[PDB]
Amino acid sequence: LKLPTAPLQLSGTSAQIATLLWQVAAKENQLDKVQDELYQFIELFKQHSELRRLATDPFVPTLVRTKIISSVLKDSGASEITKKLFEALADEGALSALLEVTVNYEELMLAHKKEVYCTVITAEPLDKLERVELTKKAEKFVDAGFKLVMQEKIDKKLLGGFVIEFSDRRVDMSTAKKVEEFNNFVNKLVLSI
Amino acid sequence: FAGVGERTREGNDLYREMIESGVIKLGAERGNSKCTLVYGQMNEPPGARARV
Amino acid sequence: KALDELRKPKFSSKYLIQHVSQKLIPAVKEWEKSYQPPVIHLGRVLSVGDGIARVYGLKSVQAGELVCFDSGVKGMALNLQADHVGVVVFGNDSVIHQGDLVYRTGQIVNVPIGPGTLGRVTDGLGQPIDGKGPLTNVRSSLVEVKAPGIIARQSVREPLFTGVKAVDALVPIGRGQRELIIGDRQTGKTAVAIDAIIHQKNCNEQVPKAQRVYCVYVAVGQKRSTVAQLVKLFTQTGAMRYTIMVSATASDAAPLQFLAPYSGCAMAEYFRDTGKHGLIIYDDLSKQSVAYRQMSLLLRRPPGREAFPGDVFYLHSRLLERAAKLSKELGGGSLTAFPVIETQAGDVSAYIATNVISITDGQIFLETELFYKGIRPALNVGLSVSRVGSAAQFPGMKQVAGTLKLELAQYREVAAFAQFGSDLDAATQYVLERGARLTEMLKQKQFAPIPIERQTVAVYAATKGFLDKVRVQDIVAAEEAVISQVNPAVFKILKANGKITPALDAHLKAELRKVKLPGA
Amino acid sequence: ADAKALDELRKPKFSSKYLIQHVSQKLIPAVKEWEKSYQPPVIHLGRVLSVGDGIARVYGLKSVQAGELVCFDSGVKGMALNLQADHVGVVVFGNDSVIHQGDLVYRTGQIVNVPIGPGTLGRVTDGLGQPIDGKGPLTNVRSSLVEVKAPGIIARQSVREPLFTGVKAVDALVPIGRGQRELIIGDRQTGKTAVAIDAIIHQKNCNEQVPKAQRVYCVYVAVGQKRSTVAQLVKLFTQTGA
Amino acid sequence: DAGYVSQVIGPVVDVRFDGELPSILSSLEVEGHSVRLVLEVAQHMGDNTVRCIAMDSTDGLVRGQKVVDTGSPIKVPVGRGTLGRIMNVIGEPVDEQGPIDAADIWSIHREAPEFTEQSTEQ
Amino acid sequence: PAIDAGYVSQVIGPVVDVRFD
Ligand SMILES: Nc1ncnc2c1ncn2[C@@H]1O[C@H](COP(=O)(O)OP(=O)(O)OP(=O)(O)O)[C@@H](O)[C@H]1O
Ligand SMILES: Nc1ncnc2c1ncn2[C@@H]1O[C@H](COP(=O)(O)OP(=O)(O)OP(=O)(O)O)[C@@H](O)[C@H]1O
Ligand SMILES: [Mg+2]
């Protein structure tokens, strides 16, 4: 009746389940408990074959799948939210939608935990004055009061500099593209001048 | 006679014409009848008209 | 990788979130105290649009059950899908929102029928719109009923007099068959049906109560001003006390236009089930097929030829088969249907036109070429069939109708030879002029139905050459002179005795000799 | 959702084990207690996922060839025409009513074979090669593919030698060579089967006059006609000697 | 044993059986209907659900109405008892002369005879 | 103004989808 609003809107029919799951677990303030439970169920699908047989086989009856998901999730301190979610998702054969309901739930929680990711890819291992000077220039690309984290990757193709990978925008402050845009800027003038 | 999907009116006309001509006999002389009418006329939904 | 099998989802449903939200919102601990909407007898609207609402819930609803929205507008539950119900809307869909409640009524679609329906301009759902109050002396029966079987009917015997000379002689109509009036736009179809109504006003004051005919006119897809003009006309002749006006016009919603001939057939089947005689004109049945096409195409059904559904033959079949002549064990009533199918520039090989021609017994093909030749009504006498034939033709008219059919059959093949003015044959000229006499004999002004006895006398006076002396251009008034200048006793005994007796065919043979024709 | 945010769940990320530890010991008796309401899982076999209008969509069948004769457990054969991502859409050679949702489909390892050779000369077979005249199974015969490749450009020579049809208009106006694809077109009931049967009877008559290498052996293919018309053609060819 | 209606669209009714589906062309009886409705299985949908075509009108079908299998196609009363009677499509007397005498009760779906058992006698 | 201020969800030519909370 009175559901708290999700921090970022999303797509349909698999992101809507994640929107409702974030809304319900935010009414109950178990927002990081059910993320851990969904991660546990992802790895639980990874481990055994008799559980992924409940989501890829089309000849399992819905009665035994509903009773298996109820009698397994009866215990071990599972949340009411994850229990009723898996009951409703096993009644309709939507257990294969777990892998893409949890990603939209992670995007929702990452919007709420007020934390955005990034990835800086470099050529050398960064030193501590390179890193604390990197955070001031990379924070100017975020747009509000966030918690932009800084991941590190090393790739020898760059000749120094850094490239920020925000997963939606890319800032190529590297020298290997600086000299690549340098050699393109000269040859547009030699053909003219 | 397997009347498939025609009008009901001509089916009733055939039934009365075979009543009066002596082909369909009603009552106790029914055993001397020499025609079985099967009617799936236009009133019925198309499963009945497909299987009559 | 072992994770790739569960990568992409395989959904067996579309509204999966609507089933999940009926089980996650109780997982909140504070929302177990009756914080759940019931869907056993209720229903929530998922998606509205284009006069189509898709309702989640309604577990105990029936197919074809009239449900009611909480906005006040009613609707028919038509597609009962596995996870929702596709509900058409009987009105404007602007009043419906997502999340509105759908209260089912438990009733398959109902219309008020009875003796109090006479004169009431109603919709295809039952509400009168003429502003004379509600329906008083009525009862609420079903819209979709089972047609009468093979036992329940008897042979079509008694004629239904139309009043039009081109159809009462050539294409005769008995009380209980289905006669189609097919043509083009502005060719005379509605006018032939209106003449068939007004002749019932001229006839019902001369026959007893068991032989009266109560008309029902079903205007589907017409204008509102056309039905206003027709109500004004039927009141100006006084034939509204025999006529029910079922009217789902072009402003009205598409399921109302779809259910208007069914509602009218239910309102006219009351006289059939009570021993009286009924006459129904499903006017513009092609517009009813168009409204059903739209209502089905918005309901995601796969379309066929001309984007119609498959069961649009069944749509007109189960509507037209309720018109029959019942036996004496079931009251001896009758219902004479008159569908009206509009063709487009003469393509009679369309879908709906071939389906309704395949259903109905007769057909009256009105052509737009012979309409502008002065032949009004524009009856093409070659293509028009009447499959009761002479079984329900008026006696006396049967004595001259074979001559009329044969002479017009020779006149139809004497064409493509009259364009050579010197090419006289003196035998094809005789049938060539006789066909012109008979063709210009069968003309009528509109809203002027002639009684059947005067029609028989007027065509007797032309098939026997008593108007053969006049020119081809003065037969429209010489007909009236022949009707007026004879004794009034001839019609008076010809209406009563039933046939042209040998004790009459010497009287009016001589009464046509004391006539004055304006030409010699 | 994308693939970039979906590949990163292949690495374990739980940071707690209060669910995967306990239910991993509970799941095996939970699937043991519903052993009766299962079906044995098909990997290299095939289970019918659905069936309709003579078309059965078969789940499984991981190693069928496109066009391989599959054989149902009802004894009816099939032919895997389209191979989808998750299921196999096979056709049904005959009665589809003996195939239910849940049957087993065994592949045969055979691209569709028909018995060819000298022993089938004079026999009435159906469209799969099985005889329907009913005088025993086929003897002195061997299987071959129905979808062999047509011979190429080097493998053909010029059409020279004439095929006399015995019809006067065909041999006088539109003469048939002995390697010529020639269409017999027309309306219904115009005598196309007449020209066909006249050509066949003439090759019978000429086969008893040419020495052993110019003998042409006809083959008739009746597609979609009546059983009574094929029986009439069999009685006609047997009373002629064709 | 008995299944329920899952989906009603037009004259076509999708019936959901839980365990041991009926065959194709099998005759299904809807229990609870006013007029005796008979469904004939046209195909198997694929999730323990058949797709039937209705012999009578589907006006008045509820999702969840119990449908019982008859294990056979549409069985009609055949024989000498049918002469002079007007049978229905499901084999019911519609001539209002009482029930039909039954020589044998045959299913309406069967095979074409054979190639061997033919008569070439014009 | 959180409620009664929707955002554009998708655009297909002259057809715009707005999604509301
Ligand atoms: N007997 C007649 N004599 C003279 N005029 C006639 C006669 N009958 C019909 N008409 C004229 O022909 C026209 C017929 O129109 P009608 O009522 O048939 O419309 P419709 O063809 O049914 O539908 P639409 O308006 O879509 O074309 C009328 O305008 C009327 O004036
Ligand atoms: N040259 C001919 N002389 C006399 N009669 C012939 C000749 N050719 C064919 N007919 C007759 O014409 C009829 C039709 O012949 P045929 O069956 O070959 O036509 P068709 O094209 O095969 O028709 P369908 O394809 O519908 O079976 C046969 O009864 C045959 O006897
Ligand atoms: Mg009109």
Ligand SMILES: [Mg+2]
């Ligand atoms: Mg042929």
